[PDB]
Design a protein around this ligand. Structure first.
Ligand SMILES: CC(=O)OCC[N+](C)(C)C
Lengths: 218, 56, 236, 338, 276
């Protein structure tokens, strides 16, 4: 053996190895989510709709699933330096306000640029992005007076709610070029608890896809 | 105001622009001398026998 | 604060049994190791049992294995030792110590209080010997002590396993030097340790009147753990 | 007015450029043309510290070249034993977003940073036998990137808000603040004399502060992208900066100029960490192309590769006696080389 | 013309061995590949390796000579080992189908509920079931009163001329896994399609049929002959031997069907081939 009183340190090493193993097993069962957006994107409305300086880690549970929403927009620096910390997240909650008839450049142009930047990143090739469209009532009210061509010269067609919403959704959705990740879309405006069950459904679908890919059956 | 920031910047530039300097050749020679003079206790450039290697 | 206190002593008829509990408070009990060191009325110290963290490995003495058992309940920070079929040579008080083990740790850094235990009348292990049990000393001078062993204690790791101790009159023993070279915490920068292989010495300089008592030596190479007869130091 | 200030700044920059051009006479290769090379350096792994469960972001050697700390986003900060691939401590953290760690030169304390503006300081020699938070420092408004101890009583931190600060741990307040950078700061290296230090910014610059007066001494702007790691030459008169544009520089203080640049055409990734060796002949670096690179420090010649890591390496340190070198990557493994 | 028979054998056997060594180092090499779903692939790799290098070589040395080289006693051990290891590979396929089904159908509860101990228990159960099924009868039937009926030259288990304990073992060992995996993969294909809304289900179906046909085509004919000889001796020495080789080939197809399809495993081989 050759070990003298060193046998009493190997016991400590194995004890803490077991502790780390159990801690990892217990901490691998919480689904992690990330939340992005832009200025006045309505993300406050949904983060305050979830009922139980730095990263405001929000925690809640639903259908016996430990959720972790890592709201990070509070940082003030060059963004690209710290996203890779948030790799291996399960999904991304992306909130876009449908009041894009204003300038700050055009707001929807900025949202399109940011979505294109954050959708073709090298880290998020396989990371599905959940797309929330907020303030549907305001957009529907505003489209009665002003048409969609006031911001999209290329757009042609009517000035009705459903067709304009479909056009906006198609414009956001056609920005992904990878064939692995999928984009889930939804529309809400300060509505009922529906904002959480859609997230739950999207997470379940992403976990199923991950299991199929891992098993090699995909 | 930008005037105060520019004044501070130019003051810092003047403060840091008045430091004595040497020839780069002497600096390179000093680096070479230090690298050569302390090279006998570097157990990476000169591999050490396993008789006194705790990791082996 | 760190506190150790033991209860359960008294008197018991020959062949009887009794329980003893070492109740502890003020530290992370569940991450330590506990011993039991009994002391005869006039003799030195004898090691009785041991139990590590998580109760993984338990060792016993040579005159005790098969009779006593040792167990601990760390959720309630209390230690236990079941003694059965007592003998007239067990009429000694028991102690309780603290033995954290990792790289750089200092074992036996604390010592219990001691519970009395009186019972009415009716070769291959390491042996460590000391020079004399009675040496008178004078204040203001430097004195030395020695404790020669029988087996070389310099392990192949480069470490030597030997622990010096001190026992003030009527109180618990204290740790002074661990591994024959390091100085423990709280003990002054006055004492010093030295030695090589089997001849060990401890050096004291500018001796005061608070350092009177008996000094004990211990080995920690392999179990069981053996002590010495000690050396009494008295004023004038 | 504005025109006068612009003219003064332009004149100062032109004078500095002219003085730097005049002070340069020859390159370093000419003086080092007779220097013997080192040859191929065959280094093999000796230990593989398989203990983590996520990507490792920082590590720091002890003081006796044996104990080691690794910080990773699995949530833990565990102290290793290098000589016998053993573990001695495991510290659960509050925020799992960790980008830096430190080891006090006395070995008593360790400090962890993170992405939540707070540099928490731990204790290792408690009387209860457990590691426990002593004081939390919260004065920044960005994200901390590096933290190096000065002694047991004061620490130096750098955060992603163009500020670097010195803290007094006894009180918990912020003693001195440093400013002058334009972008984020991502690296910091205390000098051997513990009297001044360097800090590389994300806006492709590096400045020299001193911990006595709080004013910037020099600045070295000749480099084309954000800087990710700095470390001094053992002499305490030079330091190497590793940016993201495939090149690493070597600067000198009194010469006040860039000395050498280390690159090859096939290299297209970015540096992640920089260290040296005890004699200051071997330059190490950490690349994004899934490996390490041993760099000759006097010939700028590719002179060995520490390949073997499965993912990008993010931390690289050597012992205090140059006996071993350790590397940790985005896979949970650490390695020891000789 | 003898080399033509030995070249095919050598190539298939070696292609098996190197691929499975690559897989075995592939799991330990990638940190994520150290998942519970890959202990089953270790088991499968060991099974196909054993029957790959030793059994293929033996039948091939033996394929054309027709004379037992190592005598009667050794041949029985060879038969027992071959049958046990092949059965074990089939059980490994069955348990992989099982845990794939449970992972797909219950993605929340099941993946965390089971631990490494459950995988070890399943592997041990499969192996001991293979031993219990094959090892006893082959060795002990000679010890029923009948004299070794087998002629010396031919090392074939006499259990195949026996009393319908041949039908029982055949029907179990082959028919039960085929039906079970077919029924299970049909449910997997049905549950694969998206509920929140080429495609996903089509790809899953196109992989499931690939695996199922690759298994069935090889192993069906030998069972057909097994069910015919017991009742009646058409017995071409032309295809009895190929009848057995259409069984040993499933080992070589097993690395591709179970580690090629996986994207992570395919990417792992790239690093292993690099710096080689
Ligand atoms: C186990 C089984 O029944 O099939 C094995 C066929 N053989 C002998 C070719 C391996």
């Amino acid at each position: 053996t050759l070990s003298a009183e060193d046998k009493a340190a190997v016991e400590r090493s194995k004890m803490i190895e077991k502790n780390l193993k159990e801690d990892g097993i217990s901490a691998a069962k919480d689904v992690k989510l990330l939340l992005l957006g832009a200025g006045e994107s309505g993300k406050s409305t949904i983060v305050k709709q979830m009922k139980i300086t730095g990263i405001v880690e929000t925690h809640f549970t639903f259908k016996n699933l430990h959720f972790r929403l890592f709201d990070v927009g509070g940082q003030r620096s060059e963004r690209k330096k710290w996203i890779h910390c948030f790799e291996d997240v399960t999904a991304i909650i992306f909130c876009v306000a449908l009041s894009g008839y204003d300038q700050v450049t055009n707001r929807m142009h900025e949202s399109l640029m940011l979505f294109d930047s954050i959708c073709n990143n090298k880290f998020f090739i396989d990371t599905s992005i959940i797309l929330f469209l907020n303030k549907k009532d305001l957009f529907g009210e505003k489209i009665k007076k002003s048409p969609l061509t006031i911001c999209f010269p290329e757009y042609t067609g009517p000035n009705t709610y459903e067709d304009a919403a479909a056009y906006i959704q198609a414009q956001f959705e056609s920005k992904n070029r990878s064939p692995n990740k999928e984009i889930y879309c939804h529309m809400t405006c300060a509505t009922d608890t529906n904002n959480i069950q859609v997230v739950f459904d999207a997470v379940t679908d992403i976990i199923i896809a991950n299991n199929l890919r891992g098993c090699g059956l995909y | 105001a930008s005037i105060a920031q520019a004044r501070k910047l130019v003051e810092q530039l003047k403060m840091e622009a008045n430091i004595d300097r040497i020839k780069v050749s002497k600096a390179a020679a000093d680096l070479m001398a230090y690298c050569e003079a302390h090279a006998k206790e570097d157990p990476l450039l000169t591999p050490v026998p396993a008789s006194e290697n705790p990791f082996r | 604060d760190v506190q150790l206190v033991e209860s359960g002593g008294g008197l018991v008829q020959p062949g009887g049994s009794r329980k003893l509990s070492c109740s502890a408070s003020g530290f992370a009990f569940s991450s330590f190791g506990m011993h039991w060191v009994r002391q005869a009325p006039e003799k030195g110290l004898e090691w009785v049992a041991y139990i590590s963290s998580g109760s993984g490995t338990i060792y016993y003495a040579d005159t005790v294995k098969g009779r006593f058992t040792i167990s601990r309940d760390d959720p309630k920070n209390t230690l236990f030792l079941q003694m059965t079929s007592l003998r007239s040579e067990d009429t000694a008080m028991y102690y309780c110590v603290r033995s954290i083990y990792y790289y750089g740790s200092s074992p036996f850094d604390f010592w219990g209080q001691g519970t009395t235990l009186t019972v009415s009348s009716g070769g291959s292990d390491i042996v460590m010997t000391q020079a004399t049990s009675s040496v008178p000393v004078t204040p203001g001078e430097s004195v030395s002590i020695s404790c020669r062993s029988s087996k070389s204690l310099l392990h192949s790791n480069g470490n030597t396993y030997l622990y010096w101790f001190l026992q003030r009159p009527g109180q618990s023993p204290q740790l002074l030097i661990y591994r024959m070279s390091n100085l423990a915490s709280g003990v002054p920068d006055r004492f010093s340790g030295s030695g090589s292989g089997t001849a060990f010495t401890l050096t004291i300089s500018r001796l005061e009147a608070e350092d009177v008592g008996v000094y004990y030596c211990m080995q920690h190479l392999e179990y069981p753990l053996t002590f010495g007869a000690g050396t009494k130091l008295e004023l004038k | 007015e504005l025109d006068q200030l612009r003219q003064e700044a332009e004149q100062l920059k032109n004078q500095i450029r002219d003085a730097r051009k005049a002070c340069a006479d020859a390159t370093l290769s000419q003086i080092t043309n007779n220097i013997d090379p080192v040859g191929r350096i065959q280094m093999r792994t000796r230990r593989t510290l398989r203990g983590h469960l996520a990507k490792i972001y920082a590590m720091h050697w002890g003081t006796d070249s044996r104990l080691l700390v690794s910080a990773s986003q699995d949530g833990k900060l565990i102290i290793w034993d290098s000589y016998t691939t053993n573990k001695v401590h495991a510290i659960p953290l509050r925020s799992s977003w960790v980008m830096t760690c430190a080891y006090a030169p006395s070995g008593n304390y360790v400090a962890c940073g993170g992405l939540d503006n707070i540099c928490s300081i731990y204790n290792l020699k408690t009387r209860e036998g457990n590691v426990r938070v002593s004081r939390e420092l919260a004065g920044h408004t960005g994200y901390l990137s590096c933290c190096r101890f000065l002694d047991d009583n004061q620490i130096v931190t750098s955060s992603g808000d163009t500020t670097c600060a010195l803290w007094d741990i006894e009180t918990g307040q912020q003693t001195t603040t440093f400013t002058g950078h334009t972008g984020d700061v991502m690296s910091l290296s205390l000098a051997p004399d513990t009297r001044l230090f360097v800090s590389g910014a994300c806006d492709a610059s590096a400045k020299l502060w001193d911990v006595r007066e709080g004013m910037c001494r020099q600045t070295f702007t000749g480099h084309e992208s954000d800087i990710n790691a700095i470390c001094f030459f053992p002499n305490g008169n030079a330091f190497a900066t590793g940016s993201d544009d495939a090149t690493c520089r070597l600067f000198d203080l009194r010469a006040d100029q860039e000395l050498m640049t280390y690159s090859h055409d096939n290299i297209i990734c970015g540096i992640t960490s920089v260290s040296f060796s005890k004699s200051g002949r071997l330059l190490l670096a950490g690349y994004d192309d899934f490996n390490c690179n041993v760099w000759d420090a006097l010939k700028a010649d590719r002179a060995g590769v520490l390949a073997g890591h499965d993912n990008r390496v993010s931390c690289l340190g050597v012992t205090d006696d140059g006996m071993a070198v350790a590397t940790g990557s985005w896979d949970s493994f650490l390695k020891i080389w000789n | 013309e003898v080399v033509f028979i030995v070249l095919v054998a050598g190539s298939l056997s070696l292609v098996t061995i190197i691929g499975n060594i690559l897989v075995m180092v592939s799991i330990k090499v990638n940190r994520h590949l150290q998942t519970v779903n890959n202990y089953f692939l270790f088991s499968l790799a060991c099974a196909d390796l054993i029957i790959g290098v030793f059994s293929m070589n033996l039948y091939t040395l033996y394929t054309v000579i027709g004379y037992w080289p190592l005598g009667p006693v050794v041949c029985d051990l060879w038969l027992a080992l071959d049958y046990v290891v092949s059965n074990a590979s089939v059980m490994n396929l069955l348990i992989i189908s099982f845990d794939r089904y449970f992972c797909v159908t219950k993605p929340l509860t099941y993946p965390v509920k089971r631990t490494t101990k459950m995988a070890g228990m399943m592997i041990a159960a499969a192996w001991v079931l293979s031993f219990i099924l094959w090892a006893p009868a082959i060795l002990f039937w000679q010890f029923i009163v009948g004299v070794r009926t087998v002629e010396d030259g031919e090392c074939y288990i006499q259990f195949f001329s026996n009393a319908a304990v041949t039908f029982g073992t055949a029907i179990a060992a082959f028919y039960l896994p085929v039906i079970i995996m077919t029924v299970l993969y049909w449910h997997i294909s049905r549950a694969s399609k998206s509920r929140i809304k080429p495609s996903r289900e089509k790809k899953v179906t196109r992989t499931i049929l690939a695996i199922l046909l690759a298994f069935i085509i090889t192993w069906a004919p030998y069972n057909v002959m097994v069910l015919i000889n017991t009742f009646c001796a058409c017995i071409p020495n032309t295809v009895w031997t190929i009848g057995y080789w259409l069984c040993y080939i499933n080992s070589t197809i097993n690395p591709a069907c179970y580690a090629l399809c996986n994207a992570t495993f395919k990417k792992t081989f790239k690093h292993l081939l690099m710096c080689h």
